[PDB]
Amino acid sequence: WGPGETNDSTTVEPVLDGPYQPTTFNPPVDYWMLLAPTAAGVVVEGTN
Amino acid sequence: WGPGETNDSTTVEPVLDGPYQPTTFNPPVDYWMLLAPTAAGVVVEGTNNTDRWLATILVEPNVTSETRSYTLFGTQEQITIANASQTQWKFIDVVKTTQNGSYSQYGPLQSTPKLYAVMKHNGKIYTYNGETPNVTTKYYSTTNYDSVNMTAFCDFYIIPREEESTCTEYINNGLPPIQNTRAQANEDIVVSKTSLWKEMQYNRDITIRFKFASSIVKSGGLGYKWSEISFKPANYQYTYTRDGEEVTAHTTCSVNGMNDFNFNGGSLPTDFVISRYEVIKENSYVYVDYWDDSQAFRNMVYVRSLAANLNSVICTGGDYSFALPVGQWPVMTGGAVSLHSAGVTLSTQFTDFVSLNSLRFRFRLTVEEPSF
Amino acid sequence: AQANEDIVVSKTSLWKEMQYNRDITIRFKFASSIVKSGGLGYKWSEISFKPANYQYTYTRDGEEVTAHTTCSVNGMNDFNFNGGSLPTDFVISRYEVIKENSYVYVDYWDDSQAFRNMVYVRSLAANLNSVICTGGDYSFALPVGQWPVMTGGAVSLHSAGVTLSTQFTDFVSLNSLRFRFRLTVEEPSFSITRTRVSRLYGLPAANPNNGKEYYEVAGRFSLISLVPSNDDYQTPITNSVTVRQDLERQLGELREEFNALSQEIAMSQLIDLALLPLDMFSMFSGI
Amino acid sequence: LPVGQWPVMTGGAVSLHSAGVTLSTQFTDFVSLNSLRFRFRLTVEEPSFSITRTRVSRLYGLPAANPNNGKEYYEVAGRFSLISLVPSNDDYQTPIT
Amino acid sequence: SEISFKPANYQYTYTRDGEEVTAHTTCSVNGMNDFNFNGGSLPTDFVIS
Numbered sequence: 001w002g003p004g005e006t007n008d009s010t011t012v013e014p015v016l017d018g019p020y021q022p023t024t025f026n027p028p029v030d031y032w033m034l035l036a037p038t039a040a041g042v043v044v045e046g047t048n
Numbered sequence: 049w050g051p052g053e054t055n056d057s058t059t060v061e062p063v064l065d066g067p068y069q070p071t072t073f074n075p076p077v078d079y080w081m082l083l084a085p086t087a088a089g090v091v092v093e094g095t096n097n098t099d100r101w102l103a104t105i106l107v108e109p110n111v112t113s114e115t116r117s118y119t120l121f122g123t124q125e126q127i128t129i130a131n132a133s134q135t136q137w138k139f140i141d142v143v144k145t146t147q148n149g150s151y152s153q154y155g156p157l158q159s160t161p162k163l164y165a166v167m168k169h170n171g172k173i174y175t176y177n178g179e180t181p182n183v184t185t186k187y188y189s190t191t192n193y194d195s196v197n198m199t200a201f202c203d204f205y206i207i208p209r210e211e212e213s214t215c216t217e218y219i220n221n222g223l224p225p226i227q228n229t230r231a232q233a234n235e236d237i238v239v240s241k242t243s244l245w246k247e248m249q250y251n252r253d254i255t256i257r258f259k260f261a262s263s264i265v266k267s268g269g270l271g272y273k274w275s276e277i278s279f280k281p282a283n284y285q286y287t288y289t290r291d292g293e294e295v296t297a298h299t300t301c302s303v304n305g306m307n308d309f310n311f312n313g314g315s316l317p318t319d320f321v322i323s324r325y326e327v328i329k330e331n332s333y334v335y336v337d338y339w340d341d342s343q344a345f346r347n348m349v350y351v352r353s354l355a356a357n358l359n360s361v362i363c364t365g366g367d368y369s370f371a372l373p374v375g376q377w378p379v380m381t382g383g384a385v386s387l388h389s390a391g392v393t394l395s396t397q398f399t400d401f402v403s404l405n406s407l408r409f410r411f412r413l414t415v416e417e418p419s420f
Numbered sequence: 421a422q423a424n425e426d427i428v429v430s431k432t433s434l435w436k437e438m439q440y441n442r443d444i445t446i447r448f449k450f451a452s453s454i455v456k457s458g459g460l461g462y463k464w465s466e467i468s469f470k471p472a473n474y475q476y477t478y479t480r481d482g483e484e485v486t487a488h489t490t491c492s493v494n495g496m497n498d499f500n501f502n503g504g505s506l507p508t509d510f511v512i513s514r515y516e517v518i519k520e521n522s523y524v525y526v527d528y529w530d531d532s533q534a535f536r537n538m539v540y541v542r543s544l545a546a547n548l549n550s551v552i553c554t555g556g557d558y559s560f561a562l563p564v565g566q567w568p569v570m571t572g573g574a575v576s577l578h579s580a581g582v583t584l585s586t587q588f589t590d591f592v593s594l595n596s597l598r599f600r601f602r603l604t605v606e607e608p609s610f611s612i613t614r615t616r617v618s619r620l621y622g623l624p625a626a627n628p629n630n631g632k633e634y635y636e637v638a639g640r641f642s643l644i645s646l647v648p649s650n651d652d653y654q655t656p657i658t659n660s661v662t663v664r665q666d667l668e669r670q671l672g673e674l675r676e677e678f679n680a681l682s683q684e685i686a687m688s689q690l691i692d693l694a695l696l697p698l699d700m701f702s703m704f705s706g707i
Numbered sequence: 708l709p710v711g712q713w714p715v716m717t718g719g720a721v722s723l724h725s726a727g728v729t730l731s732t733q734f735t736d737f738v739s740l741n742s743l744r745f746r747f748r749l750t751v752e753e754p755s756f757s758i759t760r761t762r763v764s765r766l767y768g769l770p771a772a773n774p775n776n777g778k779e780y781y782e783v784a785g786r787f788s789l790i791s792l793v794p795s796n797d798d799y800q801t802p803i804t
Numbered sequence: 805s806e807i808s809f810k811p812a813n814y815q816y817t818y819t820r821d822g823e824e825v826t827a828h829t830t831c832s833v834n835g836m837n838d839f840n841f842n843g844g845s846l847p848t849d850f851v852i853s
Contacts, residue, residue, distance in 0.1 A: 002596045004598055006492045008304060011465055012307050057495070062617075067504045246433060350646070353848070
């Protein structure tokens, strides 16, 4: 005695946080922002 | 006989398509666009770029016929706005019909929730307008209504047309409130006198045929996202002959330990997003509940031992096509899994004077090429 | 090979059908899995149920019984809150709540002789009382701002029968008794603060324990089973406490009796007997 | 057993009653010893031995499994009377052995 | 296969009329009943030959 067959769900990360959109915010310290622009011109701005 | 206790799930929609941040996009036909701006000024703009330009501006209560600088389609302009509300906020529509064309005012909508609703349909632009809690709908004439984009500078939801009722009350009152929260002892009794039993070893061929079943739930909205791609208990029935005796059999396939992959193609309503789809790997098993009418399964109530020797099988991945409204259809394909009999189980459940038995062959899995 | 063959592994056994009525006090505690999605931390990837093991001891009828319980759920509903695509927005990718369309399995096993007699089981009934499993208070620790809290959530459990599973491996046989409880939604409703998702009925996986170390349901369980009893009727013919040979007689009584018999003797017949040469056979045959 | 409940052999009892004593020999490595061999008749007693996990109960005797029941030894106290014939050719001597 | 008796030797010392006497004994048994348990023909079942 005596456990039985049981519900079991394993979660797998996608591999990336997800392709996010262009918008304004202040990402937390100790985190990298990786831009992948499609067209030339301005891509990223940083203003304190 | 004979289904076993099988894995089950139920995916409940969030209630809305979700707050999609303010970004430029072109919603398809027959989809209501709802906006709940946080700040006054320009909130939503709809442009066909050839002969129709529309915009909505949210004005605070107690605003005289004053001029303010607003950015429409990228150009600053001294737009004039008037208001007489005390407690409400005024949504004012502004229209023009050329790149250099003059501007005009139409509307308005004096509402408390700061919620506006627009849509396109059959060469018309529908908008919720009037007064609460008795709001009405209005239609604006135009050409090439399908070419109009709708770029919003404030967070906006998308709703299907069929749920316009929920849209209507959503203009009666804002989106659901943020809620702003803070006898005894032991007895044994013989029910039947001494019985008489024996022990028998039945060896029989088993040719178990099981087929998977896939549950496909697509998230509401435009239709570029799928809410769930899961496995489902798959029933099957058949017949086969052994030793000259015909026997009918029933089978029920299911999975356990499945891995949930969740690809994200972006939050734009037109991006291909899979909220959650299930794939079986090294750390997953596939159960097959089998039962027939042979003499053996009649004599399987009181079982002292069961040993199954089965030949492994390879299950490939089929071709499924996602029917996106526009673009190119993604197709899931590939993936081969080899099954190995990792023992058997006998599950019995009781109800009054009737019991349900189930012979569950559990197969462990090994991944092999081709990939998926 | 192919075709059919049946071989008798053991001859006619001897079994009897018994019915054991015993009080069972099942205690069970939930367990939650909290997988936070990689990133800023404002989004939680999974708030799910996980099988929860527990061990305890209780006394019934003056006997101490140690029991083990394993709580799990089935048919749970997956709610998902989508608070925005910004990395700073609060999002719950998938969290599980149990409703009318959900069951909670409780796999129970102890060391009482009834369970030892439970292998070949004919019928099982479990008169069990209902319990109100509430939801605790779990705080989502965001990097900044007010921490959202999941609170509330209660559900009533009712005895929806019992299952007995037996999985065979090599030559061992793992058994498992499974009390499956069906669920009824009732107040208070649960909700997560600083969000529009509120007044939903169920018991979310955030804190099913609610501080309580174990949810208890007591009752009676009746097990009509078949077991190995010969009814003390398979033993050796002579098996018993050694039969006592009773005391015979004190010799004085015997002298009295023989002297009393002395007057019953006929003289002619006595002398006639007193000429037969009584040998060993003659004297010891007539006794 | 590595699997399932562990059967236990409990119970079992017999009374040893003295019945007869004779001469016997103990075989050592390099000498042989004269010894007294006592017979004991067995009488079954109330404790009945049974094996758990089995259809065995109300069996009487003393199995060989654990007949000592943890006791260091089984003890009987009594007296033996011996009369020995010692070779003697005079009334004043008497051999010790 | 078997669970049976075996003769056993013992040594000790005890007092007799003030004499510490060292004693040696050897216990054996005869006329025994060979019971048996046969759980089944499988290698799994409890069997006492």
